[PDB]
Design an enzyme around this catalytic site. Structure first.
Site, PDB file in Angstrom:
ATOM      1  N   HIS B  41      69.738 -13.635  62.510  1.00 29.37           N
ATOM      2  CA  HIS B  41      70.931 -13.003  61.924  1.00 29.37           C
ATOM      3  C   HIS B  41      71.412 -13.680  60.639  1.00 29.37           C
ATOM      4  O   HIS B  41      72.324 -13.154  60.004  1.00 29.37           O
ATOM      5  CB  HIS B  41      72.086 -12.818  62.892  1.00 29.37           C
ATOM      6  CG  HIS B  41      72.711 -14.086  63.379  1.00 29.37           C
ATOM      7  ND1 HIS B  41      72.363 -14.629  64.590  1.00 29.37           N
ATOM      8  CD2 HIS B  41      73.742 -14.799  62.861  1.00 29.37           C
ATOM      9  CE1 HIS B  41      73.137 -15.697  64.744  1.00 29.37           C
ATOM     10  NE2 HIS B  41      73.996 -15.824  63.740  1.00 29.37           N
ATOM     11  N   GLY B 143      79.534 -20.372  62.011  1.00 21.99           N
ATOM     12  CA  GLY B 143      78.660 -21.316  61.325  1.00 21.99           C
ATOM     13  C   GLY B 143      77.882 -22.254  62.231  1.00 21.99           C
ATOM     14  O   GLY B 143      77.023 -23.002  61.744  1.00 21.99           O
ATOM     15  N   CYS B 145      75.699 -21.362  64.633  1.00 22.65           N
ATOM     16  CA  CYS B 145      74.406 -20.825  65.026  1.00 22.65           C
ATOM     17  C   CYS B 145      73.253 -21.595  64.403  1.00 22.65           C
ATOM     18  O   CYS B 145      73.378 -22.117  63.293  1.00 22.65           O
ATOM     19  CB  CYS B 145      74.329 -19.327  64.777  1.00 22.65           C
ATOM     20  SG  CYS B 145      75.416 -18.369  65.875  1.00 22.65           S
TER      21      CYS B 145
HETATM   22  C1  LIG Z   1      76.725 -17.829  64.817  1.00 20.03           C
HETATM   23  O1  LIG Z   1      77.214 -18.963  64.101  1.00 20.03           O
HETATM   24  C2  LIG Z   1      77.849 -17.211  65.654  1.00 20.03           C
HETATM   25  C3  LIG Z   1      78.462 -18.161  66.697  1.00 20.03           C
HETATM   26  C4  LIG Z   1      79.723 -17.606  67.383  1.00 20.03           C
HETATM   27  C5  LIG Z   1      80.912 -17.422  66.441  1.00 20.03           C
HETATM   28  C6  LIG Z   1      82.137 -17.879  67.255  1.00 20.03           C
HETATM   29  N1  LIG Z   1      81.587 -18.643  68.365  1.00 20.03           N
HETATM   30  C7  LIG Z   1      80.261 -18.540  68.434  1.00 20.03           C
HETATM   31  O2  LIG Z   1      79.553 -19.086  69.259  1.00 20.03           O
HETATM   32  N2  LIG Z   1      77.319 -15.995  66.245  1.00 20.03           N
HETATM   33  C8  LIG Z   1      77.915 -14.824  66.048  1.00 20.03           C
HETATM   34  O3  LIG Z   1      79.000 -14.697  65.506  1.00 20.03           O
HETATM   35  C9  LIG Z   1      77.224 -13.629  66.619  1.00 20.03           C
HETATM   36  C10 LIG Z   1      76.647 -12.828  65.475  1.00 20.03           C
HETATM   37  C11 LIG Z   1      75.132 -12.915  65.591  1.00 20.03           C
HETATM   38  C12 LIG Z   1      74.668 -11.718  66.393  1.00 20.03           C
HETATM   39  C13 LIG Z   1      75.800 -10.693  66.332  1.00 20.03           C
HETATM   40  C14 LIG Z   1      77.009 -11.378  65.712  1.00 20.03           C
HETATM   41  C15 LIG Z   1      78.149 -11.360  66.697  1.00 20.03           C
HETATM   42  N3  LIG Z   1      78.134 -12.702  67.294  1.00 20.03           N
HETATM   43  C16 LIG Z   1      78.829 -13.100  68.356  1.00 20.03           C
HETATM   44  O4  LIG Z   1      78.932 -14.275  68.675  1.00 20.03           O
HETATM   45  C17 LIG Z   1      79.510 -12.018  69.174  1.00 20.03           C
HETATM   46  C18 LIG Z   1      81.006 -12.042  68.906  1.00 20.03           C
HETATM   47  C19 LIG Z   1      81.716 -11.145  69.907  1.00 20.03           C
HETATM   48  C20 LIG Z   1      82.459 -11.732  70.917  1.00 20.03           C
HETATM   49  C21 LIG Z   1      83.125 -10.955  71.853  1.00 20.03           C
HETATM   50  F1  LIG Z   1      83.848 -11.561  72.807  1.00 20.03           F
HETATM   51  C22 LIG Z   1      83.080  -9.572  71.775  1.00 20.03           C
HETATM   52  C23 LIG Z   1      82.308  -8.982  70.786  1.00 20.03           C
HETATM   53  F2  LIG Z   1      82.257  -7.646  70.722  1.00 20.03           F
HETATM   54  C24 LIG Z   1      81.627  -9.758  69.842  1.00 20.03           C
END
Ligand SMILES: *C(=O)[C@H](C[C@@H]1CCNC1=O)NC(=O)[C@@H]1[C@H]2CCC[C@H]2CN1C(=O)CCc1cc(F)cc(F)c1
Ligand SMILES: *C(=O)[C@H](C[C@@H]1CCNC1=O)NC(=O)[C@@H]1[C@H]2CCC[C@H]2CN1C(=O)CCc1cc(F)cc(F)c1
Lengths: 305, 305
Positions: B41, B143, B145
């Site tokens: 991603h 950030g 990931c």
């Molecule tokens: C990558 O750094 C990040 C880590 C996340 C951000 C906050 N905490 C954490 O661990 N990953 C993401 O933000 C990912 C990205 C990559 C694939 C899709 C996109 C969405 N996502 C994610 O963590 C989902 C967020 C989400 C949480 C939730 F409770 C309901 C949702 F509909 C979406």
């Protein structure tokens, strides 16, 4: 998202750990520049431990009696001296992996990371708080002495602890890097006991702020209190009295969440008086006091080193 | 003496962390030999996140669109490919700090250390278990990931996890180093939910053995049970069914303490049915399941790396 007991990355400290042997006793040492720092009880045998006279014991020790090993390679000891409860072994080689460092005597209530070592090799990393009664809640076995506690600020390692002993309540005692014990403890096998384990009030409050930021809000109540009325309730529960300095230190967390510190005190007062009723806060069923306001800000802001 | 959630020393992993930027998005990468592994991603913008077509997105990406930075120095990307949910960026320089390593797909119930990173720089280290529902309880922000989970066995680092997402219950999901998610999770911003958070029974039992070794014996009762009768009680509490393999894995801890595994099950059954009554075990008021029998043996035996 999420809140965990997080230790600093230990890489910079791993390159400083050495093994120090004197006679039959082997423990850990910290090699910074051309000096190795280690607990002075490395010179004792089991018999000596009850009532040692370290100055007398040290006259029978020369530079060559200290075997220092950094990995599979032997360092040459060219000098030695005792400073309080630590020995400083001058060696002929500066540690090429010496990071930017300082020695700090830490205040009770502050936290640090411990890199537990055995035979000069790292075993694990975990966070500790220097408790109000000057003990830490660690995990140490025979041979762990000389393992250190530290904090990292960008590129600078502040060493604040060297492990020396265990107390009857399963808690640990040790010195700063100048060899001075935290608290009233002494490096001898005598009857020593930790005083009242007072709770770090400002740290419980910081952790309550971390819970709010992470979505746990059940404990927030419709009450407020004063510093004086909160302290009356917290004295009963062996909590450290909260001061205006503590309130100012929680200033940024209070501003970030919109919850005044005295409103969080009222919520904490209800938690002390009524308990959690089987509920949890950040996966815990107890009030946690080993996170400082800075630890919470660091973790919730993604501060790197 | 003492028992703590202990992470492995992170030094060997710290030398592998790099920053990977693609367009406006920056995340972490793992640089081993001449390859940098990172979440796919990194190629997405915020818009793409809802329903990305990673193969389509990747056609508009060349080697030069991936900015890889190891500290203050830029690496040159000479190739790229997508393997499941990870990208492998071939770079022109082998990482001189590459440790002895292997990639392992870890079994649920096993534990590992996470080195949380932001902008390719380490922020902290903590232990996690790959839970039965294939989530982990971490601490990750935007950030994070590309941050990895690993185990160390002497000099060999087994990487088992790369961070990709958060779930609505504040728990985390990610992949092995081959890019395959643990569990049914997908790397898109869709409605995904963790299943029942089943408790790792064998790990609660291992932790009960660590408590006995460390002096906490209040919960030991005069009862025993059978595997079948224990499992009847534990099904009600969402505990993983205990098998003969689990009993054999607890064999060494049972032999070290003289407490048969089925006697420890009876004590655990009383703890599930009656609770702790305000008491604590190794400083916790909840039954802990993120210590494997090996973690307990390691910590109580002083195993070093
Ligand atoms: C990558 O750094 C990040 C880590 C996340 C951000 C906050 N905490 C954490 O661990 N990953 C993401 O933000 C990912 C990205 C990559 C694939 C899709 C996109 C969405 N996502 C994610 O963590 C989902 C967020 C989400 C949480 C939730 F409770 C309901 C949702 F509909 C979406
Ligand atoms: C140094 O490696 C070692 C670490 C200890 C061993 C077990 N856990 C732990 O943290 N330190 C000691 O063993 C020290 C040595 C150095 C100074 C005196 C001698 C005794 N001691 C120590 O920890 C005290 C042991 C003790 C515990 C207790 F509960 C009652 C006692 F009377 C003595």
């Amino acid at each position: 998202s999420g809140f965990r007991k997080m230790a600093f990355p230990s890489g910079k400290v791993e390159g400083c750990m050495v093994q120090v042997t004197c006679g039959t006793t082997t423990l850990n040492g910290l090699w910074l520049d051309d000096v190795v720092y280690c607990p002075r009880h490395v010179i004792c045998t089991s018999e000596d431990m009850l009532n040692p006279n370290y100055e007398d014991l040290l006259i029978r020790k020369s530079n060559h009696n200290f075997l220092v090993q950094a990995g599979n390679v032997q360092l040459r000891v060219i000098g030695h001296s005792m400073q309080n409860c630590v020995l400083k072994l001058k060696v002929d080689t500066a540690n090429p992996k010496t990071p930017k460092y300082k020695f700090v005597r830490i205040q009770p209530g502050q936290t640090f990371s411990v890199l537990a070592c055995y035979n000069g090799s790292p075993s694990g990393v975990y966070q500790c708080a220097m408790r109000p009664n000057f003990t830490i809640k660690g995990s140490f076995l025979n041979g762990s002495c000389g393992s250190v506690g530290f904090n990292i600020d960008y590129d600078c390692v502040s060493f604040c602890y060297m492990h020396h002993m265990e107390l009857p309540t399963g808690v640990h005692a040790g010195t700063d890097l100048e060899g001075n014990f935290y608290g009233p403890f002494v490096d001898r096998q005598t009857a020593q006991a930790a005083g009242t384990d007072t709770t770090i009030t400002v740290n419980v409050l910081a952790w309550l702020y971390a819970a709010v930021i992470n979505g746990d809000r059940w404990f927030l109540n419709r009450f407020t209190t004063t510093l004086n009325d909160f302290n009356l309730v917290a004295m009963k529960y062996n909590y450290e009295p909260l001061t205006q300095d503590h309130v100012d230190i929680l200033g940024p967390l209070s501003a970030q969440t919109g919850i005044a510190v005295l409103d969080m005190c009222a919520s904490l007062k209800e938690l002390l008086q009524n308990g959690m009723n089987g509920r949890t806060i950040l996966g815990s069923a107890l009030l946690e006091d080993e996170f400082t306001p800075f630890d919470v800000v660091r973790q919730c802001s993604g501060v790197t080193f």
